[PDB]
Every structure is written in C-alpha cells, then in structure tokens.
RNA sequence: UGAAGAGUUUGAUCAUGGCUCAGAUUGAACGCUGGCGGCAGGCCUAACACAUGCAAGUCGAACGGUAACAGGAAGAAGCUUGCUUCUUUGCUGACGAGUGGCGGACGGGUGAGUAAUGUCUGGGAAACUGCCUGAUGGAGGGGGAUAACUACUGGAAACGGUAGCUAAUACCGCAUAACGUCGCAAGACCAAAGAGGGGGACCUUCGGGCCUCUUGCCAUCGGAUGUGCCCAGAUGGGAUUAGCUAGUAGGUGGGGUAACGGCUCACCUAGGCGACGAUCCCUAGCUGGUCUGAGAGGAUGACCAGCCACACUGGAACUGAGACACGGUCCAGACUCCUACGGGAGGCAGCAGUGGGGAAUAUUGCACAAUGGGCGCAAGCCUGAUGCAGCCAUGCCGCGUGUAUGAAGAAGGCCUUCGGGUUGUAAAGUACUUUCAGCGGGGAGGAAGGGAGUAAAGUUAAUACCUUUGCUCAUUGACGUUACCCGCAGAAGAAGCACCGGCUAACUCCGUGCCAGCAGCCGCGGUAAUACGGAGGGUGCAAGCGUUAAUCGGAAUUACUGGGCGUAAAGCGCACGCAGGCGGUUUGUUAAGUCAGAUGUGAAAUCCCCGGGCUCAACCUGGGAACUGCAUCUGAUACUGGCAAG
C-alpha cells in the first residue's frame, strides 16, 4: 500500500524536487527534472484551475507516502481541532512518526525510515512501534532499540541532513537515541512552498 | 426479586461491564430502573477499575433488592 | 407435543373436575337467596344468606375462586334485602 | 384542581351530559403560524345547571361512561 | 467554526426551464483481480412446504418408593481360613418412572396482521401484584380416599376398564378471629404445615416428645418492582371514498370483571361523530437513533435497546399470581402422515439444516469455563439465550508486497521528422533490513467464586450445631498447538483495476472505413479516428477496483430560513358573501400568547468536547454538555389576546 516502482519521475511530474532521492548529485538532474515526465516528455502543459489544487494534494501525499484513504482522515480530524484548519492539518502531518524520525537525523529517507519503523527498530519514549502513524505528542524521546543500533546506515545519516537546517521544533542527540518533540511546528518554519489554502479548498464540497 | 447483576458492553474479548440494579425476569443487558457504577476487568493499573458510589445500593438494599454474586465480589473487593 | 407438560395438563383436568363441580355447590347457595329475594320472604332470606357467608369465604380463601368477588356479594345482596321488607 | 381548563358549551341534547370545546394556541410546527384550534369532550354533570353557550371550569375525575371522563366544578357564564 | 459547480436547446447571446454529471452512503448482487490481521456484519424474496438432531427442566431437605447404580449389614458362600462369590436388607448414599410443589405466561425467533387507547411524550385514579422487603399478630384437632403398584380383561398400535393396598405440604371437614371483609352501628363470617441440623438434662413402647437454631407455611398493613385502566397532544397515501352509526349515544336499574366502566341483559332518553377530513379502499409495525444536509428539511426503522402483535388456518375456553398459552387441551377443517381400515400421530415466524422461489445471504460447530436465567438449604442440573470457532474482500481502520546506490543514461519496446527520443535510476550489478505469512521455542489476562481446612466479640448446653468476619492448602477456562515477546532463513511467498475528446487529473501511433463497435449527457465510425478495435506511454486509486440497483445532496427543481405568475407553465369571465385569516384610536384590567426565573422530567447506548485503555487507528471507555421537549410554581407588563370604558 505505496508507491512502488519508480521514484524521481514523480518529482518530474510535480515540478520542484521531492525528498526521495537526496544527498548525492541527483539535485541537479540526474534524471532531468521538468525534461520527461513521460513519453511525451518535455511538452506544453497547458494548466487548467482544477490542476492547480490537485498538484498540491499530491505534492505533500507523496512527500510523505500516504494513500487517499488516510489523507482525508487527516484532513477530517483537521476540521474538529482549534484553529485554523490547514495550519492544523500541517500540524498532524509533522507529528506523524516517519516524519520526526526522517528530520531527527535518522535514516536517509522517508521511505527508509518508514520500513525503519516497520522493521522493530524505531522505540517511542520507552515502548516499541512499529506502526508508521503513531502520532507524537510533545515531550517525548525518540529512541532505537539496543539490538539495531549500529547495522549499517544510521552513523552516515546525520552527516546528510546537517547541511540542511536544523529546525526548531525538536531537539535531537547527535552522539546516541534521544529525542524531543519540542513544541508545535508553526508556519514560519515550514517548507514555505506548500499552499495550505489549495488542500482545504480541495476536499470542501 | 429485583436485582443488582453486571451488563456486558465489551468488545470481543475485552469485557466491560455495567454495574446495573435492574429486574430479575429481563433481558441479559437490556433493561434496568437505574445505572449506577460500573466494572472492568482489565484494569492492570489502568485506572479504578471499580467505582460504585455504594450509599445508592445502600438505598436499594433498603428497598428489599436481593443482590448477585460478582457485585457481592466488589463489595469486598472495595473497602 | 411431547414434554413433560402431562404433569402439568392432566393436572388441569384433574383441576377441572374437581373445582368446577364445587362451584356449583356456591352457585346452588346464590340461587335460593336470589329466589328468597324473589320470594317476597325476608325471614328465610336471613337464613340461606347467613348460611352461605361461611360457604362463600370456604371457597374463597383457599379453593376456588378467590380475591373480593366473593367478598362484595356481602355488600350488594345485603344492600338488596334491607330494601325489600 | 389541575389548570380548571376554561372551556365552552357546544351542545345538550343528552341526558345530564354536555359538550365542551376549549380554545387553545399553539406554534404550527413547521411554519411558524398560530392557529386557533380547538378540541372537543365530553363532560359529566348532574345538575343542568350550565345552558348552551356558557363558559364551563373542567377537572378530570374517574372515568364514568364511554367516551366522558370530566366532571364540572363550576360554571362562571350565564347563557 | 459553516454554504463551490459545470455540460447540452440556438448560427451566436441574455433569461426561463428541465434531463445528465462531479459528492457522501449502503444488510447489496454481478465481472475481473486477490497477501495477511483486528472490529462489526451476513434469507431484504414464499408468514410456502418441511427430512434429522436438538431449543425446559428441577427438589429425596413433600410422598409412598425400590427399578437401576454404589457402599454396607445379615445369611448362603468364590474358602481366596480372610481375601471377597451371591442372596435377603430400602439399610444408606443415591435414584428411573408415578403422586405433589414451583417454572414452562420469561429468554428466544419472526414483522403476516394492526392507521388504531398500537407507539411516543406530559398528566390522573378506580385495582391487583408469585417470588424479594418493613413492622405487628397468629400458626388447635380430626377424617375420607386414590393412582403408582398388585392380580386380571379391551385394542393393530396409540391406548381401556376394574378390585386390592399406603402416604403427604395431596386434598375434605372442624376448633380459633383484627389494625380484615359485609354492615351506619349493633352484629355475623372466614385460615394453616411441616421439615431438616444439633443435643445440656430427664423420660421413652426407646419410635420420640424435650431444648435450641435455620427455614417454610397463615392473616393484615406498608415499601418497592412488574402488569391491567383512563385523559390530552403527536403519528401513512387517496375527497375520481361525504355521509356514518343502533348496543349506536346517554340515564336509572339489576347482572358482570381484580378494578372504573355499555363489559353485558331488560327499561327509558334520542342521540354520537364529521370539512380542525368521519366511514371507506390501498399501503405500512411504532421510538430512542442510523444516512444525508452548513442548516432547517428530506428518505429510512436491518444490527444492539424500548413496546405491542402473531405461533399451520378458524374458534372457544381450563388451570394459573400472571396466558386466552411457540416446543400444553378441546372443536373443526386444511394439508400432511400412518393404519390389521377399526384408528392414532403431526406443526422450524427456536438454533443448525433440505426442497423451492431466488441476483444473492453461511455450519446438520465446540463448552457450562465467563455474565445473566430457571429449580432449589446448597452441591449441582439445565439453558442451539449468551461466551467462542469455521464460512464469505460485504463494510470500516491499520499493515506489508523491500530500501540504499547505480547509468554505458544497457540490450528491449514503440515513437522517429531517421538528428533521435522515451520507458528510465527504471532494470542489471554492487550495498542493506526481515514487518507480516513460512518455520522454532518459551509465554500475560479475561478467575472471582466454589469446595476443603482453621481462627473471631456472635446466639444458645460456656466450647453442640449453624450464620458472619479474617487466615491456610488444593484448586477450577470453551476459546487455546491464545494475545503478545523471543529464535533462524533468505529479496526470498505477496499488485492489480478503470479511464485517457468535452465536463474530468492523463496522448501519441498501427488496424478497420456510416461496416464491425462505443456510450452517463454532449456524441463518435462514410481512408490519415488524441472517442471504435490493438500497441507503447500517461493518469487516479489500491488489496481491491469498476458496472448496475437504492436514498438524500448539487435542485433556490414544492422555496418556513430560500421562489414565482405584463408576454417564459400560472390572476377563476364577474359579483356579494357563511364558516375561516386579519385590526383605527385612549384608559383601566386580567396574565391565556410570549419573555424571565427555578423545580420536575426528557431511559442508557450513538452525535459533541476535555480524559483514559488496546504497540496507533477503527473499536471499548470515565465525566460533562446537549436531548432544541413537554407539565407546574414565582415574576414581567411593552407588544398581542378576552372583559370593561371611551
Ligand atoms: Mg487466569
């Protein structure tokens, strides 16, 4: 239940560079971005209004690996909660556990973390996970257990994302296991690309 | 010859009960005068998992409510 | 059908012999006070009426037929013979 | 007494028993509107001493024949 | 804390309107594809007919009992000279049948009937209440039999009739009499039972009184709880159904039910209901709530929960605290079954199954271990209600079918303007990890009770017994070769399905040439089809995806919040008017309309907000708010409304 077979021609289709291949040279076109999203490659996308909304839909899905059935109960819960509606459904996607594991250092990419937390190995605050939506509340410590902790993969995964921005919203134990979700992510610190108002407008019918 | 006995909301093998002072000839959790307190035995430090506000009892034993045997369990297994 | 109900049914019949004759035995007892009062009499109606006020609460009680049925005929056939004679 | 539900005489054609309608508001459920309705029962009285078209104080009482379970207490109308 | 639209009449356009589409949802079936696990779901059609198993039994602590079992006694004995072969013994545990007691009137299954006192809300009195409970008081003595059985006789079975014999808490008398019934009083009348446990004394035909405890049994008054009854409001369509009704409507009477009653029978009165929709035919079980809608509003009543109705089809009742009685009786038939032809048995709208009509809806499952029920002094019995397991993607919420790196941008496929391009970092090859399934081993909780012992201030013989409290051991699960944790392989078992002209996210080529075909509307095909058929590539979704069927939404397209009518469907040809709806102008006043305040009450479960628990989520859940409601007291007089005055 995701998307299996290729990887960066999605990022062709969507335009700017999603993080699924990252770190090594393919952020300059190691598959030609904006060049072939398929046969009829580079071509004239003539865009409509509808197309403009449901790019962004499946921009921050497939930024993240998560299906229509699960998205919209984000986007159901996002109604109940306080506040506003979108800044609240960015909310509960960075709370979402494959995401602090992904930033707080740990693997190369979502997509590896993911089937770190689906292989035993990712422990919330004492208590062993291995379901890639336990949704994190502050204060909590990220942990991986003693058994998988120097495999292959974790030690050159720090390195990577140490070159980008060390975000404010947790804090994280370069040296061993620890974490903490910090307080909530706002907008000023998100993406800052990602349109809020074109997901809300979306599933309002 | 009316009674105290437990109803059943649970899941499947996840009991919950109800504490229910309810009649003797009806339904198996279907019917009672009235609900007070309730049961779990799945407490494990869960929380309480009794809680009965006893003096209504002590009403209806004043009335001539014959009781049954698991509320008779948390009679003593409440102090 | 087949049970153990022939305990019970037969039983019936058994209760069904034996009480519906004993209330003809009350009823033979509320015809002659009913013929008294027709009768014009009011000192013989004293006699049947004071008769079958043992004979009305025997068979109401304990037996057959039972819970103040019996105990209003003391008032309305009381109420009858005071404004005859 | 219970509201003494003020009412009128409709109709004596019955021996000692009247008819009794009774004006009363109300909000139309769905509209928004109030329509005067009235209904109609029966009603016990011995005396004839309410005449056709009088105004009648009405509390309930035992059910005495079909279709009549009212009797009057006073009368505060001449016809 | 909430509200989106677009396509098609015409050569074009502004309006009016329909039809169709994007959404959300289902007890769903069918096509194709299909790896797991949790929760809930699964004859909606013939309420038509049912093979076969099962779905109501219990108390020996009511009774004679002794036919079966088991312990013994006694005697005969395997003599096996003390190990056990049998019979007497109802001697006992214990117990088949029959008397007797309570319960089978609940739990269940169905929605055919019922447009209504059936349901739903808020009020009321004219009565009962088996079992549980409060207090007071009572609780003497006799008698008649009889199945069962015995011996006999009828019938083919099913079954039938006799005499013998004994019991009771079976029943029939009889003594006794209120704070009880009748009665204004005075009066009169009515009831019953033992059973175990244990022994202190004495007595004893050694049966037992005797003493004590437990516990029934009787009468009355309460308290609950359940059920009968009443009142008013609210509850489907059709006025191409407008008149209906005599036990009908009312009153004295008798009679009648537990109770008021036209509930019944004679008599008098002549009524009763109806445009605020009666009778009528058609259709339908009703509510809490589910679905949808921002809301009002709209269709729904399967699941779990409330309440009635019905047991093959029509009837009537018996018992009973309670039934007009699902696994009881009688009267018929009807099918159906059986017969020596004379007769007897039958009722799946119980769970599991067959026939059959069917688009289609499952197993001739396991256990009394849980929580509830029945019977009990408990033990225990019994329970196709419940607790569980198989069946089926029917639905919901997870979860994996690998992740790095990697181009020479590979052979390969089609496109190619033969410059190339694309699939495509995709694969290959190097790295790396085993969730789940495979396979291996240990492994929570749902278990408290019960039974056994042993202690205590219990009350009595002060230590007997029993009742209560605390302690000690042994314990007691269907599920279940459980959940979960742990061990080892090896990328190893695991990806479909529709669309690609417009709405509507994605395009180019071969084949066919108004033929074959598509399609939801607009429409496409008559030699270059971005629409038919095929191939590469793309899109959306995913263990499912499409199609059909079905409800709301878009629909301001039945509009109260939210429409219109001079020409777009639509102002009766025109008049007075009855019942209906609606008030100039000032004061007084009442308090129904309405506002306010509380107090009742709106069953719990869903919806909603903070909070807990399954490794998260569905789901289970603590408390709140809300349930927009109706009825009552207190208050308010500005509007409105009845009375009074202008
Ligand atoms: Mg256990």
């Not at chain 1, 960015?90 to 693997?107: H, I, K």
């Not at chain 1, 910090?182 to 074109?198: F, V, Y």
């Not at chain 2, 996840?14 to 339904?27: G, L, T």
Request: net charge positive; glycine share 6%; aromatic share 6%.
């Amino acid at each position: 239940a995701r998307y299996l077979g290729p990887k960066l021609k999605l990022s062709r289709r969507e335009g700017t560079d999603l993080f699924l291949k990252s770190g090594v040279r393919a952020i300059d076109t190691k598959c030609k971005i904006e060049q072939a999203p398929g046969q009829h490659g580079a071509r004239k996308p003539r865009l409509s209004d509808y197309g403009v909304q449901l790019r962004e839909k499946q921009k921050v899905r497939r930024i993240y690996g998560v299906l229509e059935r699960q998205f919209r109960n984000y986007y159901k819960e996002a109604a109940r909660l306080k506040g506003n509606t979108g800044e609240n459904l960015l909310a509960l996607l960075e709370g979402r556990l494959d995401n602090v594991v992904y930033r707080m250092g740990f693997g190369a990419t979502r997509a590896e973390a993911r089937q770190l937390v689906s292989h035993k190995a990712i422990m919330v605050n004492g208590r062993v996970v291995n379901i890639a939506s336990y949704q994190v509340s502050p204060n909590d410590v990220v942990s991986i257990r003693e058994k998988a902790k120097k495999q292959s993969r974790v030690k050159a995964a720090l390195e990577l994302a140490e070159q980008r921005e060390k975000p404010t919203w947790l804090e994280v134990d370069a040296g061993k296991m620890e974490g903490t979700f910090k307080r909530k992510p706002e907008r000023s610190d998100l993406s800052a690309d990602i349109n809020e108002h074109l997901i809300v407008e979306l599933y309002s019918k | 010859m009316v009674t105290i006995r437990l109803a059943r909301h649970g899941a499947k093998k996840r009991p919950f009960y109800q504490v229910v002072v309810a009649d003797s000839r009806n339904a198996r959790n279907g019917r009672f005068i009235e609900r007070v307190g309730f049961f779990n035995p799945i407490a494990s430090e869960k929380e309480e998992g009794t809680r009965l506000d006893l003096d209504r009892i002590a009403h209806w034993v004043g009335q001539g409510a014959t009781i049954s045997d698991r509320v008779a369990a948390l009679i003593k297994e409440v102090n | 059908n087949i049970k153990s109900a022939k305990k019970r049914a037969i039983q019936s019949e058994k209760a069904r012999k034996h009480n519906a004759s004993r209330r003809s035995m009350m009823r033979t007892f509320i015809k002659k006070v009913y013929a008294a009062i027709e009768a014009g009499d009011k000192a013989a109606a004293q006699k049947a009426f004071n008769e079958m006020q043992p004979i009305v609460d025997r068979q109401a009680a304990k037996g057959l037929i039972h819970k103040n049925k019996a105990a209003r005929h003391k008032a309305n056939l009381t109420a009858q013979i005071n404004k005859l004679a | 007494k219970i509201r003494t539900l003020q009412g009128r005489v409709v109709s004596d054609k019955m021996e000692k028993s009247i008819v009794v309608a009774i004006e009363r508001f109300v909000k139309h459920p769905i509209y928004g509107k109030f329509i005067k309705r009235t209904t109609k029962l029966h009603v016990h009285d011995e005396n004839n001493e309410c005449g056709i078209g009088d105004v009648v104080e009405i509390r309930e009482c035992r059910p005495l024949s079909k279709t009549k379970s009212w009797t009057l207490v006073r009368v505060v109308e001449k016809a």
